[PDB]
């Protein structure tokens, strides 16, 4: 479970916010793209896996699961590409709640930047730093370090 991530795609302002969630910690990375394509998804995963030890990615939909470009990125970066079937129904709810939380934070910061991408990065920062007492950023580091040791 330390290497397991979940992709998630949500929409705002006629743009697409692509999110990767570290399942065990709730830590996220995100980017704004014009539309979700295999190319954009592939590039995003390449970035993610250069930054964290990404063992498994549960793709967000069937198009990204199918995409040869996404498969090729997963091959390049040594990621096991998996489906995103919520065999645990709690998964849908957690992701939906996360999207609602992120959009709420974006709303709270929206007037602090012209561009949506800026507001999204502010939202990533707030989400990852929020104490719930550890933060998601603390949990991911602890989980991974424990795994290394």
Ligand X SMILES: COc1ccc(CNC(=O)c2ccccc2C[NH2+]Cc2ccc3c(c2C(=O)O)OCO3)cc1
Find the binder of a copy of itself among 75, 107, 108, 145 (CB under 8 A).
Answer: 145
Q: Note whether 21 binds a copy of itself by CB under 8 A.
A: no
Q: Note whether 66 binds ligand X by CB under 6 A.
A: no
Closest CA to 5 of 138, 144, 145, 148: 144
Closest CA to 59 of 75, 49, 74: 74
| Angle formed at CA 98 by CA 95 and CA 100, multiple of 5 degrees | 115
Q: Which does 68 bind (CB under 5 to 8 A by kind): a copy of itself, ligand X, none?
A: none
Output 29 or 60, the one with its CB closest to a copy of itself: 29
Closest CA to 7 of 15, 47, 34, 129: 47
Find the binder of a copy of itself among 16, 33, 77, 94 (CB under 8 A).
Answer: 77
The pattern of x and - marking residues 31 through 70 that bind a copy of itself according to CB under 8 A reads: ------------x--xx-xxxxx-----------------
Q: Note whether 115 binds ligand X by CB under 6 A.
A: yes
Enter the tokens of residue 29. 């990375």
Q: Which does 69 bind (CB under 5 to 8 A by kind): ligand X, a copy of itself, none?
A: ligand X
Q: Note whether 76 binds a copy of itself by CB under 8 A.
A: yes
Interface residue list for a copy of itself (CB under 8 A): 29, 43, 46-47, 49-53, 76-77, 112, 117-118, 121-122, 124-125, 128-129, 137-138, 141-142, 144-146, 148-149
């Amino acid at each position: 479970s330390p290497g397991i991530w979940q992709l998630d795609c949500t929409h705002l302002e006629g743009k697409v916010i692509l999110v990767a969630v570290h399942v065990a910690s709730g830590y996220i990375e995100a980017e704004v793209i014009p539309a979700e394509t295999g190319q954009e998804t592939a590039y995003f995963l390449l970035k993610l896996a250069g930054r964290w030890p990404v063992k498994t990615v549960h793709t967000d939909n069937g198009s990204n699961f199918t995409s040869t470009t996404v498969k090729a990125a997963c091959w390049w970066a040594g990621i096991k590409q998996e489906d995103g079937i919520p065999y645990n129904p709690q998964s849908q709810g957690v992701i939906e709640s996360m999207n609602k939380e992120l959009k709420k934070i974006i709303g709270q910061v929206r007037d602090q930047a012209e561009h949506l991408k800026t507001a999204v990065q502010m939202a990533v920062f707030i989400h990852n730093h929020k104490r719930k007492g550890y933060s998601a950023g603390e949990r991911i580091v602890d989980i991974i370090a424990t795994d290394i040791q």
